[PDB]
């Protein structure tokens, strides 16, 4: 573009589209599980992965992932979530924070237990 065109029209600042819409500014957000079930992932994977349809404090409902091996989550379980998606499960754009509210830590876990909300063992 000519310098003149730049004086006229200018350069256009790119904008950032948050990948974590439901969070409404905040770092984490509180909620309750309405549905708790398993969803099979997209190619080229096969599994029964753990999810929860969760109702937000912002009166939103998001599909959220349940990390670890096994969980104590059920319908009506109050839960805390955080950002970051799960590539293989579409629509699941957030993660459940284990070891908060009715989300238990992972029983018997010995490695990286901060991520899976397990207290230090014997």
């Amino acid at each position: 573009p000519t310098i003149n065109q730049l004086v006229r029209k200018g350069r256009e600042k790119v904008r950032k589209k948050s990948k974590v819409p439901a969070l409404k500014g905040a770092p984490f957000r509180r909620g309750v599980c309405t549905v708790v079930r398993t969803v099979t992932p997209k190619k080229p994977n096969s599994a029964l992965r753990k999810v929860a349809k969760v109702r937000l404090t912002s009166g939103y409902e998001v599909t959220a992932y349940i990390p670890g091996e096994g969980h104590n989550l059920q319908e009506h379980s109050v839960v805390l979530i955080r950002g970051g998606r799960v590539k293989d499960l579409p629509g699941v754009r957030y993660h459940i924070v284990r070891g908060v509210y009715d989300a238990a830590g992972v029983k018997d876990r010995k490695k990286s237990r901060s991520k899976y909300g397990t207290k230090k063992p014997k």
Partner: peptide, 10 residues
């Protein structure tokens, strides 16, 4: 937001 019965409404 109302759930089958929970004192949690959302």
């Amino acid at each position: 937001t109302v759930x089958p019965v929970x004192p949690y409404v959302x």
